[PDB]
C-alpha cells in the first residue's frame, strides 16, 4: 500500500495547496467579472467558487486532491490569460437548462428516470 506521491506526503500539504488555490481564485474573481464584461456580480462568482470547492470536499487521498489542485491551477491559468471566452466562463453558470426535478413525484410525472 506504499505509493509514489505526486506533490504532498500527507494531507497537511494538500490542504495547504487547497488553501493557496482558493486564495488565488478569490483574488481572481473580480478581475474575471470586470474583464469579461459578465452580467454576474462578484458575490455570485465567489459563491460559485465556494460551491465547487465544497462540492469537491469529500476526498481523503493525497494524490487525488493533488491532481484536483493541479486541474484547478490549469483552469486558473486559462482564466488569468484571455484564452477562455465569455461562454467558457459562463459554463459554470447553467442558465439555459431547465431545473431538474428533485422529489419523487415530479420525476414520476415527467418520465421513467430514477
Amino acid at each position: 500500500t506504499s505509493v509514489k506521491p505526486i506533490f504532498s506526503r500527507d494531507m497537511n500539504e494538500a490542504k495547504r495547496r487547497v488553501r493557496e488555490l482558493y486564495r488565488a481564485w478569490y483574488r481572481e474573481v473580480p478581475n474575471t467579472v470586470h474583464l469579461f464584461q459578465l452580467d454576474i456580480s462578484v458575490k455570485q462568482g465567489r459563491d460559485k467558487v465556494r460551491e465547487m470547492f465544497k462540492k469537491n470536499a469529500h476526498v481523503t487521498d493525497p494524490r487525488v486532491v493533488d491532481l484536483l489542485v493541479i486541474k484547478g491551477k490549469m483552469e486558473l491559468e486559462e482564466t488569468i490569460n484571455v484564452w477562455k471566452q465569455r461562454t467558457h466562463v459562463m459554463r459554470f453558470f447553467h442558465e439555459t437548462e431547465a431545473p431538474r426535478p428533485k422529489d419523487f413525484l415530479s420525476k414520476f410525472y415527467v418520465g421513467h428516470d430514477p
Binding site: 419523487f104 413525484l105 414520476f108 410525472y109 421513467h112 430514477p114
Partner: protein, 688 residues
C-alpha cells in the same frame, strides 16, 4: 481414480473412460467444428466435419463419436485435419443455394462461420445445384428445405426431447429429404426449439421473418413469466423495439429450450396496450386524463376507506416489488384483505412453512428420482420444461411414472392409475400395488399440481397427498436429504405472493365485500361486479386491458415484464430478476413507482424511493427473495403433516380433470397470449 491420460497437441490431460475426442478437446479448451453434434442430442456422426487426426494412425476419426484411448495424441491443427475440414466444407457448399442475402440465418449462420474459419475461399463446382420442394409444418416454422444440409438434428430432437416422432428422412442418396412425407404440421409445446438447433437457414421463425438481422440487435438477459418454470431468456431488441426472444443456457431449469408461448408472446406484448390513465366521465365512459387527476381520485377514494373496506387482488404477472408496495399501502390503512386469483388451501399449515407450497426437491431432482407420481395435473402444458425434464429422466435414468387423473398424452408411457381422488386413500392404506411400488423406491417423488387445488376439496387432496408423502418418507428407504412432497405451480406470481404473506384465493373478498377494490393485473375474471356492492370503486393497474379494464373506474397503465427490472419467484423457490429491455409505452410507469406515488398523494408515504430500497424492504419481509439463482432449502415437513391432521375434509366424487387437455388450450392462458396474433394463428391451425 480411473482417469486415463490422453494428449491434445502434445499437452497431457486426464479424462474419464468413455470420453470422446471432442469432449477431451473441449476440456483442453479447443472447439472442434461440428454440424450434427449436439450435447443434448444423441450422436449421429454423419456430417464428418469433426474429423481429426490421431498421431501414428493412418485414418482420420470422427471426434464426435470416437472414444479416446490411452496414450492417444490428438492433433487438432495438423495438415491433414485441415485438408479434411476443407474437403467437407467443399462438399457441404457444393449444393447449397446462393441465398445468403435473402436468408434469416445470415450473420449468425454456423455454416458461414465455419466456412470462413476452417473452409476454403473458392469453389470448383461447375455443375448445377439441386433444388428441394418446400414443406409446410405449421404457421410457426418457415421451411426452406433447399438450404438443409441433412444434419438430422430434426429427427433426433423430435424423437428424444419433443417425443413426437413425426420427422424423418425420405428417399435415398442425393435425393434424401427431411420432412413428414405428408401434409402434417409439427405442433408440439417445444416445436420452435428446432429453429434454435438448425445450423442453417432451413428452419426459421415465421413471425421473425425478414424483420431484423443479428448484428444490429441488442441482447438483454431476462426471465420468462409465462409459467412458473422461470426460464431464462434473452430478449433481442432493435432501436427500442422488441424483435425476438431466444433461450438462455441454464442447466438447472430450462437447459437450452423454452416453450412456444415464451418464444412467440412478444407480438401480443406489443398490442392492446394501456398507455394513459383513464377515468370515468359524466357519461360513464373511460376517457384519458393526466397522472395527477387519476392519482388524486384514487387517493381521495382510498382516504375514506379503513379496515376491511378496501381489498386487492393480485394477477398472474405481478412482480414482488409491486406486491410488497401494495401490501404496505393497504397495511397503512389496516387492511389485511390482500388476495390472489389462484387458490391454495390455507387450512392447517397454510403459507407459514415454505415446504408445503414449493417444488421441494429441485427441477433437476427428477434426474435423481426413480419413481415419480403425478396427481391431478397435466405437466405438458402447465409446465412444459418440467415435462421435458421428466421425459429426459425417463429416457436416460429409466424412470417410472404414474398419473392420477385424465389420461392425457405426456410424450412418454406412464401408468394411468385412474381419475378418482379416492385411489389416493388407497395409497396411504397400502391396498394398491403402487403403494408397494412407492415403498420399494429409493428416491420417490410425489408431484401435486396447483390446478388440482383449484377445486373446492383442495385441502383434502393436499392432506391426502401429504399423508402419502410422509408415510413413504419416514418408513421407506429415504435418506432424509431427499424431499418427496412437491407442488408444481402454474402462475409466475403465485410463489412470490405466498412468500410475502398474501391470502390465497379470493374467498376473503367474497366473505365481506369491500367498497373499494384494487386490481393489480387481475385479468382472470375471478371477481366481477356482480359479487361486489352497488357502488364499488374498482381501480385497475396493468399493462394489457383484457378483462379487468372495462369494469374498472380508474385505469393506471403499468409496465410489462420486459419493461422493468422485476423480481419473480419460480415454482421451486428460486428468486430471479428481469432486466429492462425496452421502456413502457406512452405514460405507462413502473408498478411500485405507481403505488409509491399513490401513497405520496394520499399522505401515507411508503419508506422507499428507489429500487434498492424496495429490495431492502423485500429482504426485511423475507430474505430469500433477494438471493438470486439460489434455491433455499425448505424444512419441517413433519410439522405441516401434523397440522394437516387437525381439520378433516372429505374428497368430492368428481374425477380429477386438468383444465388443459390438448394443445389447443395451451396457447392462450394469460393476457399477453390472448392479445397475440401468432397465438390466434396457432389455435386456428390446431382446431382446423
Amino acid at each position: 481414480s480411473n482417469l486415463i491420460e490422453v494428449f491434445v497437441d502434445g499437452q497431457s490431460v486426464m479424462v474419464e473412460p468413455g470420453t470422446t475426442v471432442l469432449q477431451a478437446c473441449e476440456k483442453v479448451g479447443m472447439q472442434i467444428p461440428r454440424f450434427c453434434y449436439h450435447e443434448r442430442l444423441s450422436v449421429a456422426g454423419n456430417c464428418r466435419m469433426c474429423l481429426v487426426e490421431i498421431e501414428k494412425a493412418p485414418k482420420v476419426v470422427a471426434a464426435c463419436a470416437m472414444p479416446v484411448m490411452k496414450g492417444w495424441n490428438i492433433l487438432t491443427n495438423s495438415e491433414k485435419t485441415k485438408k479434411a475440414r476443407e474437403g467437407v466444407m467443399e462438399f457441404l457448399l457444393a449444393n447449397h443455394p446462393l441465398d445468403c442475402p435473402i436468408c434469416d440465418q445470415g450473420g449468425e449462420c454456423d455454416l458461414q462461420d465455419q466456412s470462413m474459419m476452417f473452409g476454403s475461399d473458392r469453389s470448383r463446382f461447375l455443375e448445377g445445384k439441386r433444388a428441394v420442394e418446400d414443406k409446410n409444418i405449421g404457421p410457426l416454422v418457415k421451411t426452406i428445405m433447399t438450404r438443409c444440409i441433412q444434419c438430422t438434428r430434426c429427427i433426433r430432437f423430435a424423437s428424444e426431447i419433443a417425443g413426437v416422432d413425426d420427422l424423418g428422412t425420405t428417399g435415398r442418396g442425393n435425393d434424401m429429404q427431411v420432412g413428414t412425407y405428408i401434409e402434417k404440421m409439427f405442433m408440439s409445446e417445444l416445436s420452435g426449439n428446432i429453429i434454435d438447433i438448425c445450423p442453417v437457414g432451413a428452419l426459421t421463425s415465421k413471425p421473425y421473418a425478414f424483420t431484423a438481422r443479428p448484428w444490429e440487435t441488442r441482447k438483454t438477459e431476462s426471465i420468462d413469466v409465462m409459467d412458473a418454470v422461470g426460464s431464462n431468456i434473452v430478449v433481442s431488441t432493435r432501436t427500442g423495439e422488441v424483435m425476438r426472444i431466444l433461450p438462455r443456457m441454464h442447466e438447472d431449469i430450462n437447459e437450452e429450450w423454452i416453450s412456444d408461448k415464451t418464444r412467440f408472446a412478444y407480438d401480443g406484448l406489443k398490442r392492446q396496450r394501456l398507455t394513459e390513465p383513464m377515468v370515468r366521465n359524466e357519461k360513464g365512459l373511460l376517457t384519458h386524463t393526466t397522472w395527477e387527476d387519476a392519482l388524486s381520485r384514487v387517493a381521495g377514494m382510498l382516504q375514506s376507506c379503513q379496515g376491511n373496506d378496501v381489498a386487492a387482488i393480485a394477477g398472474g404477472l405481478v412482480d414482488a416489488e409491486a406486491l410488497i408496495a401494495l401490501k404496505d399501502l393497504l397495511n397503512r390503512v389496516d387492511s389485511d384483505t390482500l388476495c390472489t386469483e389462484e387458490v391454495f388451501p390455507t387450512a392447517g399449515a397454510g403459507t407459514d412453512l415454505r415446504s408445503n407450497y414449493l417444488l421441494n426437491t429441485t427441477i433437476a431432482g427428477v434426474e435423481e428420482a426413480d419413481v415419480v407420481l403425478l396427481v391431478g395435473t397435466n405437466p405438458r402444458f402447465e409446465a412444459p420444461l418440467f415435462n421435458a425434464r421428466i421425459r429426459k429422466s425417463w429416457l436416460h435414468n429409466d424412470l417410472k411414472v404414474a398419473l392420477i387423473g385424465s389420461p392425457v398424452d405426456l410424450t412418454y408411457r406412464y401408468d394411468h392409475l385412474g381419475d378418482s381422488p379416492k385411489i389416493l386413500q388407497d395409497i396411504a392404506s397400502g391396498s394398491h400395488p403402487f403403494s408397494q411400488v412407492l415403498q420399494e423406491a429409493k428416491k420417490p417423488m410425489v408431484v401435486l399440481g396447483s390446478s388440482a387445488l383449484q377445486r373446492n376439496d383442495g385441502a383434502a387432496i393436499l392432506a391426502a397427498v401429504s399423508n402419502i408423502a410422509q408415510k413413504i418418507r419416514t418408513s421407506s428407504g429415504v435418506t432424509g436429504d431427499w424431499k418427496v412432497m412437491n407442488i408444481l405451480h402454474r402462475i409466475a406470481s403465485q410463489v412470490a405472493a405466498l412468500d410475502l404473506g398474501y391470502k390465497p384465493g379470493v374467498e376473503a373478498i367474497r366473505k365481506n365485500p369491500p367498497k373499494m377494490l384494487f386490481l393489480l393485473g387481475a385479468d382472470g375474471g375471478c371477481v366481477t361486479r356482480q359479487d361486489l356492492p352497488k357502488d364499488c370503486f374498482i381501480v385497475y393497474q396493468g399493462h394489457h386491458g383484457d378483462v379487468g379494464a372495462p369494469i374498472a373506474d380508474v385505469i393506471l397503465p403499468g409496465a410489462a415484464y420486459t419493461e422493468k427490472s422485476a423480481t419473480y419467484v419460480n415454482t421451486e423457490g428460486r428468486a430471479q430478476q428481469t432486466k429492462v429491455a425496452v421502456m413502457p409505452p406512452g405514460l405507462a410507469r413502473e408498478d411500485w413507482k405507481i403505488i409509491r406515488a399513490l401513497s405520496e398523494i394520499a399522505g401515507m408515504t411508503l419508506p422507499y424511493d428507489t429500487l434498492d430500497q424496495v429490495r431492502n424492504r423485500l429482504e426485511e419481509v423475507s430474505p430469500n427473495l433477494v438471493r438470486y439463482d439460489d434455491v433455499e432449502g425448505a424444512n419441517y415437513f413433519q410439522q405441516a403433516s401434523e397440522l394437516s391432521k387437525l381439520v378433516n375434509q372429505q374428497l368430492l366424487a368428481d374425477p380429477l380433470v386438468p383444465p388443459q387437455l390438448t394443445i389447443k388450450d395451451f396457447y392462450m392462458t394469460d393476457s399477453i397470449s390472448r392479445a397475440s396474433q401468432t397465438m390466434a394463428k396457432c389455435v386456428k391451425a390446431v382446431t382446423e
